[PDB]
Design a protein around this ligand. Structure first.
Ligand SMILES: [Zn+2]
Ligand SMILES: [Zn+2]
Ligand SMILES: [Zn+2]
Ligand SMILES: [Zn+2]
Lengths: 108, 305, 585
């Protein structure tokens, strides 16, 4: 919506941003080499609250997305969708007019 | 053993206790608070102590939600209705914020957030339990908390897998290191130029006027000591729209962000070193310059200057 | 040493560029801001943290004026009742007593105690004789001189102050002007025994003024002249005055005259460095300042005392508000004043561009700079309370010059037994009492043992009159803390408050200065002067030692005796520990 009208000034940086706090998040993270959210359970650190929140689940068994078929736990919707698509007849015969459909790619 | 205090010191302590517990306390809580410092084993002491509290104009007495104005001995003996004691709203405002409701900059919603931190005291409240207890979302809580971040001590903590900060009322940056960073940041800027307002914004010296003053002084010192040069850049289409920038020089051994304008050709760099006619009325003078400036017109900042 | 950070007065205005700052005996600053006075009320704090705001708190002082020249039509002064809505034009505190006098815009002088008016000065005569233009306080005794539009220096003097509100009454008037002349008084200065006064036509008169003489010799030291007297001061009996382009020095020991060109027409303020070995003055103006040594000959020398700081501040400001040197700029001084002890100076000023300024009240602001005038300093008998602390802080906490035999500590010899209320006066007039009061501002735990010995000696002598129970209780308390024998008496004391009464064995008052236990097994703390139990919700608090004092004007149940009544009536406002005014609730 609103136009990108805050330009990073550093040598060899191309980026422009919508609102000045975001330009500052970029500058402190990329160019100065500082981060604002530390893991309690390992050495790593993160640039956003949502990124530390994802990393915190990785230290735990009670992972926040749970499979509808097998009940395996995962941390975000992309992982869930890819995993659940393995519980489907995903693959299709690529050859002309052939009707068949398959569950594991080596079968196809 | 009863702790020794002067007769009027309890008025301070009861005010602090009342301001902590959201503006009102029960008579039993008042007696519990008093029992630490006076021997309430006898009604004679109770009558004396309750008078000290009722005598301060800032303090109010209530009964089943209504106001009460009987004699102090009547409040001790007339133990029939539900009774509570509190402080006038303007006084509660003043005791917590330092300003009266009539002039204070804190909004009602934000003041209620402050009252929750006041109730929690030494324990304080994490931003999510605060959010749940007040009954509003984290965006709203965060946008409101800005108005009171000067009154509250805070730090990061992890709670229910979410990342949150603790808040406590206070009662429960060295610029000399950063000069090297200011020179290196300008040194790393495109063509060795950076807007001073944008440089303040990068290092986050914009959060407090205290930090702003420190930054402006540092830039001036680096200019005087010849590590940097203050320079203007002028909009090729507008001589009044000029950008205050720092230029890199050597290594250490008007407020609009113009990073938009610096994207143009903008080559009008300038390294740093009144028409008023008495006889014709001011009307005709603004008219004459507005005419002489032609079809492109003139800005109010050009006319006044 | 570095100077304290300036006190930033905001949203206040001044109506004219005259000297507007005065500094009272108790350390209170007075600024004649328009339309209401701004008082730099003094406060105590040990963590000053280099900031003057921790010493002075600024608040509006809305006095109320009533005008005796109202109803009366203006004559040869057309401006007299021109603006009928009064406002303060001049404001001076007492140098020895403790009052304030103010010249209203319509030319009345009115005298005040805090925010309460005492009296409006008036005397019989024509409309011009009743209208005042300058006033000054006697540096030795309770009296005031006022210069009127008839050219008469009129005297008023003060009585009734011990019994009731001080009566100011008319005494006499020297007509300093020539017979039938229309010139009027503009300045008066009064140092030790010599009074010096200047009329509008620049004629100046020096005379010895004393209670012992009815006939002061009005010797005119400077003839009527063209050049206006901008400022006038007495400096080690030398009179000093300044005019556009000139400084004139006169010696009153022989009435001889001398002059030096100032080299500029900007107004010069005369700052007399009274404590220096050689009579010396700093001259101050909005563009330059220098030191004139007043020996037999005059001299020009560097203002190394004050100028370097102002130049630094002015360069600092210029670096932000005139970075291109685009504008001519000036240091506008709205007032300058010496501390009551004379060891420090306060300058009220702002930096401004010469331009088409259209200011408004909300944008106006001023910096007050406090600075030390010497390398060494001492207590003074004029200044009291927080005034000592102010100098101590301004000198970067450097301690004052203590006596070599006394460096409690000294407890000087007291061979006295004067009448009781006056005995407490003589006691507080002593040098040893003053240094004790200052020491309490520096040590970790305040004390008054030296003072208690004076009351012990009085009670021990007056044994035949210690008949009252409370009076005996006070004496017993003093004896026990002092480790000197307690006078023989027996029985129980009774003390009361508005709801509760407690009986105490006189022996229950142990040697402990902190607490006492009642016969009902209830504990209570002791008062900071009479040592009695603090049972009432009406004590005043000491801002230095945090001790409590019982307000004798508020108590209406305790049957106090002559010793207790006399102690409290003498310490109902002034702190026994530090001379500061006690806070009230
Ligand atoms: Zn970048
Ligand atoms: Zn981790
Ligand atoms: Zn699954
Ligand atoms: Zn197929």
């Amino acid at each position: 919506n609103r136009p990108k009208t805050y330009f990073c000034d550093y040598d060899g940086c191309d980026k422009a941003f919508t609102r000045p706090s975001i330009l500052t998040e970029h500058q402190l993270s990329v160019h100065q080499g500082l981060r604002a959210f530390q893991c309690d359970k390992c050495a790593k650190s993160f640039v956003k609250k949502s990124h530390l929140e994802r990393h915190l689940y990785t230290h735990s068994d009670t992972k926040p997305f749970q499979c509808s078929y097998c009940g395996k736990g995962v941390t975000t919707r992309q992982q869930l969708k890819r995993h659940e698509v393995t519980h489907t007849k995903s693959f299709i015969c690529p050859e002309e007019g052939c009707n068949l459909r398959f569950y594991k790619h080596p079968q196809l | 053993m009863v702790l020794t205090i002067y007769p009027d010191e309890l008025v301070q302590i009861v005010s602090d206790k009342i301001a902590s517990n959201k503006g009102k306390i029960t008579l039993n809580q008042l007696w519990d608070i008093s029992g630490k410092y006076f021997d309430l084993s006898d009604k004679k002491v109770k009558q004396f102590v309750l008078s000290c509290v009722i005598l301060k104009k800032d303090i109010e007495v209530y009964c089943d939600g209504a106001i009460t104005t009987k004699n102090v001995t009547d409040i001790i003996g007339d133990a029939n209705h539900s009774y509570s004691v509190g402080i006038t709203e303007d006084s509660l405002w003043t005791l917590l914020t330092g300003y009266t409701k009539k002039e204070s900059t804190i909004g009602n919603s934000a003041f209620e957030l402050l009252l929750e931190v006041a109730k929690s005291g030494e324990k304080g409240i994490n931003t999510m339990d605060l959010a749940q207890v007040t009954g509003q979302d984290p965006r709203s809580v965060t946008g409101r908390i800005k108005k009171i971040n000067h009154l509250l001590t805070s730090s990061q903590l992890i709670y229910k897998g979410h990342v949150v900060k603790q808040l406590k009322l206070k009662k429960f940056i060295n610029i000399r290191d950063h000069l090297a960073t200011i020179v290196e940041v300008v040194k790393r800027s495109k063509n060795g130029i950076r807007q001073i307002i944008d440089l303040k914004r990068e290092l986050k010296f914009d959060k407090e006027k205290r930090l702003s003053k420190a930054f402006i002084a540092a830039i001036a010192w680096l200019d005087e000591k010849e590590y940097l040069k203050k320079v203007l850049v002028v909009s090729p289409k507008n001589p009044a729209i000029k950008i205050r920038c720092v230029k890199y020089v050597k290594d250490i051994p008007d407020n609009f962000n113009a990073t938009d304008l610096l994207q143009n050709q903008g080559l009008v760099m300038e390294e740093k070193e009144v028409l008023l006619n008495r006889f014709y009325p001011l009307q005709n003078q603004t008219y004459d310059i507005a005419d002489k400036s032609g079809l492109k017109g003139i800005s109010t900042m050009d006319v006044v200057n | 040493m570095k100077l304290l950070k300036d006190l930033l007065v905001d949203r206040k205005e001044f109506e004219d560029w005259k000297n507007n700052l005065t500094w009272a005996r108790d350390g209170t600053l007075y600024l004649t801001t328009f339309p209401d006075i701004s008082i730099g009320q003094p406060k105590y704090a040990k963590d000053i943290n280099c900031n003057s705001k921790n010493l002075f708190h600024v608040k509006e002082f809305p006095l109320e004026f009533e005008n005796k020249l109202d109803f009366e039509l203006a004559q040869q002064n057309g401006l007299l009742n021109s603006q009928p809505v009064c406002y303060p034009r001049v404001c001076k505190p007492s140098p020895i007593d403790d009052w304030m006098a103010v010249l209203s815009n319509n030319g009345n002088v009115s005298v005040f105690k805090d925010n309460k008016m005492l009296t409006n000065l008036d005397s019989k005569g024509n409309l011009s004789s009743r209208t005042y233009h300058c006033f000054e306080w006697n540096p030795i005794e309770s009296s005031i001189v006022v210069g009127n539009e008839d050219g008469e220096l009129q005297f008023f003097s003060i009585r009734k102050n011990s019994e009731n509100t001080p009566e100011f009454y008319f005494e006499s008037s020297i007509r300093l002007s020539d017979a039938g002349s229309k010139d009027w008084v503009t300045h008066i200065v009064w140092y030790e025994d010599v009074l010096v006064a200047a009329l509008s036509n620049n004629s100046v008169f020096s005379m010895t003024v004393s209670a012992s003489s009815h006939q002061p010799v009005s010797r005119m030291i400077q003839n009527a002249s063209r050049r206006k007297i901008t400022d006038l001061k007495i400096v080690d009996y030398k009179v000093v005055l300044t005019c556009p382009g000139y400084v004139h020095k006169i010696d009153l020991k022989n009435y001889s005259i001398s002059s030096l060109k100032t080299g500029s027409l900007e107004n010069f303020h005369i700052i007399p460095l009274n404590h220096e070995k050689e009579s010396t003055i700093l001259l101050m103006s909005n563009k330059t300042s220098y030191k004139v040594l007043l020996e037999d000959e005059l001299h020009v020398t560097a203002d190394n005392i004050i100028a370097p700081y102002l130049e630094k501040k002015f360069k600092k400001w210029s670096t932000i508000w005139n970075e291109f040197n685009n504008y001519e700029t000036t240091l506008v001084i709205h007032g300058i004043s010496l501390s009551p002890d004379g060891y420090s100076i306060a300058i009220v000023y702002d930096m401004e561009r010469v331009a088409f300024k259209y200011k408004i009240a909300s944008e106006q602001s001023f910096n007050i700079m406090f600075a030390p005038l010497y390398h060494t300093w001492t207590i003074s008998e004029r200044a009291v309370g927080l005034a000592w602390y102010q100098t101590y802080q301004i000198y970067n906490q450097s301690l004052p010059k203590l006596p070599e035999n006394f460096s409690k500590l000294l407890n000087g010899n007291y061979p006295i037994s004067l009448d009781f209320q006056s005995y407490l006066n003589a006691l507080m007039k002593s040098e040893e009492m003053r240094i004790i009061m200052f020491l309490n501002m520096t040590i970790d735990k305040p004390s008054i043992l030296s003072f208690l010995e004076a009351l012990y000696e009085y009670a021990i002598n007056k044994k035949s009159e210690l008949t009252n129970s409370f009076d005996l209780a006070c004496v017993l308390s003093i004896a026990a803390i002092l480790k000197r024998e307690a006078p023989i008496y027996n029985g129980t004391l009774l003390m009361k408050n508005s709801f509760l009464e407690e009986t105490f064995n006189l022996e229950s008052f142990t040697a402990d200065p902190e607490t006492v236990t009642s016969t009902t097994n209830n504990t209570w703390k002791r008062c900071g002067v009479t040592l009695l139990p603090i049972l009432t919700t009406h004590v005043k608090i000491c801002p230095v030692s945090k001790q409590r004092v019982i307000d004798i004007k508020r108590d209406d149940l305790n049957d106090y005796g002559w010793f207790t009544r006399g102690l409290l009536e003498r310490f109902n406002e002034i702190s026994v520990y530090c001379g500061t005014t006690l806070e009230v609730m």
